[PDB]
Design a binder for this molecule. Structure first.
Ligand SMILES: CCCS(=O)(=O)Nc1cccc(Nc2ccc3ncn(C)c(=O)c3c2)c1C#N
Length: 250
């Protein structure tokens, strides 16, 4: 209630996109904000409770690599308000812009992502949907992980088979983000058949082709990727070990 933003304080601007049960807009509120409108109207109290529970989770997070929760609204509509991230998502940088990231910057982006995930796991939060589309590069330099309130290329085999969500399935998703960073591509780009990828990854016959990792990528990083991507969940390292291996790799 200390974080509820009264009706009329936020000027909603450009629509950015929709996804994750809502639509994100840029807005103004003591500067720039992002406003994620939920697809509800006259919330039933069951919905209003699920909403307050979601806000409860977000309020647990204060970390430089976690998208900054800033408030919520109930009027005129249910919405989550966060900082605005100056710049674009990691997905745009890797798969649209084709930015020439130095390998140095790639590993740093990997390091900051692991810090945020390590933090989330220390707060007992399983992300459940980590992907480069909802990792933002604020001012091109600081990772911000969003979309953990409440697709298949980041899903661990046990999640595809359908509770499979765990710290270790988060680790697998991070390994796919690593694959994006070190190849510049999404996994399974040769295949481009969603049902085939579900079938194959789910049964454990398909994993990302690590031969596409860029040649100037360090071998310790390639091995770390392979560990996060282990088909057996219990063979995946935790984020403290990932963070150690990264920060000691640089
Ligand atoms: C603190 C996480 C709250 S959330 O789980 O509800 N996720 C979000 C809540 C509000 C806005 C979100 N997205 C978001 C947030 C900030 C953003 N800043 C710049 N740009 C270009 C963006 O596309 C952008 C997108 C997100 C995300 N992800």
């Amino acid at each position: 209630d200390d974080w509820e933003i009264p009706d009329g304080q936020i000027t909603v601007g450009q629509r950015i996109g929709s996804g994750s049960f809502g639509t994100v807009y840029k807005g103004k509120w003591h500067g720039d904000v992002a406003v994620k409108m939920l697809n509800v109207t006259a919330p039933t109290p069951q919905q209003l409770q699920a909403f307050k529970n979601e806000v409860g989770v977000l309020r647990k997070t204060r970390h430089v690599n976690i998208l900054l929760f800033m408030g919520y609204s109930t009027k005129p509509q249910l919405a989550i308000v966060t900082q605005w991230c100056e710049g674009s998502s990691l997905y745009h940088h890797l798969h649209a812009s084709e930015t020439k990231f130095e390998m140095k910057k790639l590993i740093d982006i990997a390091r900051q992502t692991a810090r945020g995930m390590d933090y989330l796991h220390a707060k007992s939060i399983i992300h459940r949907d980590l992907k480069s589309n909802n990792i933002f590069l604020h001012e091109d330099n600081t990772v911000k992980i969003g979309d953990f309130g409440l697709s298949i290329l980041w899903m661990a085999p046990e999640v595809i088979r359908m509770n499979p969500y765990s710290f270790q399935s988060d680790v697998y998703a991070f390994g796919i983000v690593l694959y994006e960073l070190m190849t510049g591509q999404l996994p399974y780009s040769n295949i481009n058949n969603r049902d085939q990828i579900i079938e194959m990854v789910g049964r454990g016959s398909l994993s990302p082709d690590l031969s596409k990792v860029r040649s100037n990528c360090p071998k310790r990083m390639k091995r770390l990727m392979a560990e996060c991507l282990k088909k057996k969940r219990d063979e995946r390292p935790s984020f403290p070990r990932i963070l150690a291996e990264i920060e000691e790799l640089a």
